[PDB]
Amino acid sequence: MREIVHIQAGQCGNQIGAKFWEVISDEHGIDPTGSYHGDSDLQLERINVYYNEAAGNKYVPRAILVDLEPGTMDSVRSGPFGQIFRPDNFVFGQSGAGNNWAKGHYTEGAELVDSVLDVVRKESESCDCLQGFQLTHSLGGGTGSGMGTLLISKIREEYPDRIMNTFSVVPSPKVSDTVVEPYNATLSVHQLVENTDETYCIDNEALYDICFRTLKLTTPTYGDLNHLVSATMSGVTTCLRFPGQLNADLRKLAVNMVPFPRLHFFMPGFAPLQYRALTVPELTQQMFDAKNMMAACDPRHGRYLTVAAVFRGRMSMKEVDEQMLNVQNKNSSYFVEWIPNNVKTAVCDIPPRGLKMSATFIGNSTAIQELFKRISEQFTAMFRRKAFLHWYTGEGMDEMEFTEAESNMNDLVSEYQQYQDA
Amino acid sequence: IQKAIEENNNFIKMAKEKLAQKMESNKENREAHLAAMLERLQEKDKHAEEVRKNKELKE
Ligand SMILES: Nc1nc2c(ncn2[C@@H]2O[C@H](COP(=O)(O)OP(=O)(O)O)[C@@H](O)[C@H]2O)c(=O)[nH]1
Ligand SMILES: Nc1nc(NCc2ccc3c(c2)OCO3)cc(-c2cccc3[nH]ccc23)n1
Numbered sequence: 339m340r341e342i343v344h345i346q347a348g349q350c351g352n353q354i355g356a357k358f359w360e361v362i363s364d365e366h367g368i369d370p371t372g373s374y375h376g377d378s379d380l381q382l383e384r385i386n387v388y389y390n391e392a393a394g395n396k397y398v399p400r401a402i403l404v405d406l407e408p409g410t411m412d413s414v415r416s417g418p419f420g421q422i423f424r425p426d427n428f429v430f431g432q433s434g435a436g437n438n439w440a441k442g443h444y445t446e447g448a449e450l451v452d453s454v455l456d457v458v459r460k461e462s463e464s465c466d467c468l469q470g471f472q473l474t475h476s477l478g479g480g481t482g483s484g485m486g487t488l489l490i491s492k493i494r495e496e497y498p499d500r501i502m503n504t505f506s507v508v509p510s511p512k513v514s515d516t517v518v519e520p521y522n523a524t525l526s527v528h529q530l531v532e533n534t535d536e537t538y539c540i541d542n543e544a545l546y547d548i549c550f551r552t553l554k555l556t557t558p559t560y561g562d563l564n565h566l567v568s569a570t571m572s573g574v575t576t577c578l579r580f581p582g583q584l585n586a587d588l589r590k591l592a593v594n595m596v597p598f599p600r601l602h603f604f605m606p607g608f609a610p611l612q613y614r615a616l617t618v619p620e621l622t623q624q625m626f627d628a629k630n631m632m633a634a635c636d637p638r639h640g641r642y643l644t645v646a647a648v649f650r651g652r653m654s655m656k657e658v659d660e661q662m663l664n665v666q667n668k669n670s671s672y673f674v675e676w677i678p679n680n681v682k683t684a685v686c687d688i689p690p691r692g693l694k695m696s697a698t699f700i701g702n703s704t705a706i707q708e709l710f711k712r713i714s715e716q717f718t719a720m721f722r723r724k725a726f727l728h729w730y731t732g733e734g735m736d737e738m739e740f741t742e743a744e745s746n747m748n749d750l751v752s753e754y755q756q757y758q759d760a
Numbered sequence: 761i762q763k764a765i766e767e768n769n770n771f772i773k774m775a776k777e778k779l780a781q782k783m784e785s786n787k788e789n790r791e792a793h794l795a796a797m798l799e800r801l802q803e804k805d806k807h808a809e810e811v812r813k814n815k816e817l818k819e
C-alpha cells in the first residue's frame with residue numbers, strides 16, 4: 339500500500355507542511371472535514387500514499403506535527419484545513435527552543451523526542467507497507483533544525499532501511515530572524531549528510547528573489563514564500579500521488595537520483611512562475627533557468643549528476659521528449675558525460691489548481707556547493723571570534739563539536755568539487 | 761545534557777559559596793570596627809576614673 343509518513347517540525351516546517359497538505363488535499367478532492375468530493379477515481383486511486391482511511395469514510399493525512407512551543411500548532415488548528423489533521427498527531431512542548439540548535443537537539447528537544455517517536459510508531463504500525471518518511475523543517479531555527487535532526491537520527495536508528503526525505507529550508511541573511519542561523523544550519527547539514535536519502539534545498543534567498551524580481555511583490559511575506567514551496571512539493575510528489583505509467587517507491591526514486599551517498603542535496607525548480615497558455619518550449623526553457631531554481635545557486639557554475647523533470651497537464655509527450663532532448667543536446671557540457679541518460683522525465687495528466695500546464699524540476703547538481711560555501715563563510719566569520727557561542731556552550735556543547743561540523747561541511751564541498759571537475 | 765546540568769549546578773554552587781564567604785567576612789569586619797570603637801571608649805572611661813582618683817588623692 340506504499341504508505342508515506344509525513345513529519346513537520348517547528349514554525350517553518352509546520353507552516354510549509356500545512357500549505358503542502360492544503361494543496362495536495364485540494365488535488366485529491368479532500369475537503370477540510372476529510373470527505374472526498376471529487377469527480378474522478380484517479381484522485382482516490384493512490385490516495386493511501388499520504389492519507390489514512392477512517393471509519394466515517396474520512397481520509398486523514400498521515401502527518402505528525404511537532405514543535406517545542408504551542409503557538410504555531412494553535413495556528414495550524416485554526417488554519418483552513420486544520421480540522422483534517424489527527425488530534426493525537428499534535429505533539430508539542432511548552433518551553434520553545436529560542437532559535438537554538440542545542441536546545442532543539444540536546445536539552446529541550448530530547449525531553450519530547452520519545453513522545454514524537456511513539457506517534458510515528460503508531461502510524462507506521464498500521465501501514466500496509468511503509469515506504470518511508472518526509473520531514474518539513476527549516477535549518478536556521480532551533481526546533482525544526484535541532485529537534486528535526488534528532489528525530490531523523492532516531493528514525494534512522496529504528497527504521498534503518500527506510501527512505502528518509504526532507505524538504506529543508508536553508509537560511510539566508512536576506513531573510514533572517516537571528517544572527518545564529520549559520521550555526522544552526524551548519525550543525526544540521528552534517529546530520530542530513532549522514533541520515534537522509536534525499537534533501538530538497540529550499541533557500542529563502544531564492545524564494546525572496548523570485549517573489550521580488552519575477553513575481554513583482556514589493557514586500558513578500560512568509561505566506562508568499564510558502565506558496566512557492568507548497569507548489570514545488572506538490573510537483574515533486576505528483577509522480578507517486580497520481581495514476582500513470584511509473585511503478586516507483588521512494589527507494590527506486592532515490593536509487594535513480596543519488597549516485598553517491600553523501601551527495602543527495604537537490605535543487606528544486608518550478609515553472610511557470612497571468613493567462614497566456616505556456617507552450618512546451620516555454621515550460622522547458624523556464625524550468626532550467628537559474629531564475630526558477632529554489633536553492634539560489636547558478637547551475638552554470640557546476641554540473642548535473644542527475645535530473646528529474648515532472649510535467650503536469652494535457653500535452654504532447656512527443657513534444658516534451660523533443661524539448662527535453664533539445665535542452666540536453668544544446669547544453670551537453672553541464673551534464674556529466676560519465677552517467678549516461680541521466681535526465682529522466684515524468685508526465686502526469688492531472689494539472690495543479692489554476693495552471694493548465696506546469697513543470698517541476700529536481701536537479702542533483704554539483705553547483706549546490708555554492709549554498710554550502712555561503713553558509714560555511716558565515717559560520718567561519720563568527721566562529722573564528724567565537725561570537726554567540728555562549729548560547730550553545732551554556733547548553734553543554736563544546737567548541738570541538740562546532741569545529742567538527744565546520745570540517746564536515748568543508749569536506750562535503752570538496753566532494754562536490756571533485757565530481758564537478760571529473 | 762549532563763555537562764549542561766553540571767555547569768548550571770557549578771554556577772549555583774560557586775555563587776552560593778562566594779556570597780556566604782563575603783557575608784561572613786563583612787560581619788567579622790563590621791563587628792571588629794565596633795569593638796575597636798567601644799574599646800577606645802572604655803579606655804576613656806578608665807582614664808576618667810584615674811582622673812577622679814588623682815583628684816581624690818590630691819586632697
Ligand atoms: N520559507 C520560510 N522560512 C521560514 C518560515 N518561518 C521561519 N522561516 C525561516 O526559518 C528560520 C527560523 O526558524 P523557525 O522555523 O522559525 O525556528 P523553529 O520553529 O524553532 O524551528 C529563519 O531562517 C526563517 O527565515 C516560513 O514560513 N517560510
Ligand atoms: N543514512 C546512512 N545510511 C547508511 N547505510 C548503510 C546500510 C547498509 C545495510 C543496511 C542499512 C544501511 O540498513 C539496513 O541494512 C550508513 C550511514 C552512516 C553514516 C555516517 C556514518 C556512519 N558510520 C556507519 C554507518 C554510517 N548513514
Ligand SMILES: Nc1nc(NCc2ccc3c(c2)OCO3)cc(-c2cccc3[nH]ccc23)n1
Nearest residue numbers: 472503574575577578591592594595646682684
Ligand atoms: N528522487 C525523487 N524524484 C522525484 N521526482 C520524479 C521522478 C519520476 C520518475 C523517475 C524518477 C523521479 O527517478 C527515476 O524515474 C520525486 C521524489 C520524492 C521525494 C520525496 C517525497 C516524495 N513523495 C513522492 C515522491 C517523492 N524523489
Ligand SMILES: [Ca+2]
Nearest residue numbers: 433445446449
Ligand atoms: Ca526542560
Ligand SMILES: [Mg+2]
Nearest residue numbers: 349437479515
Ligand atoms: Mg523563528
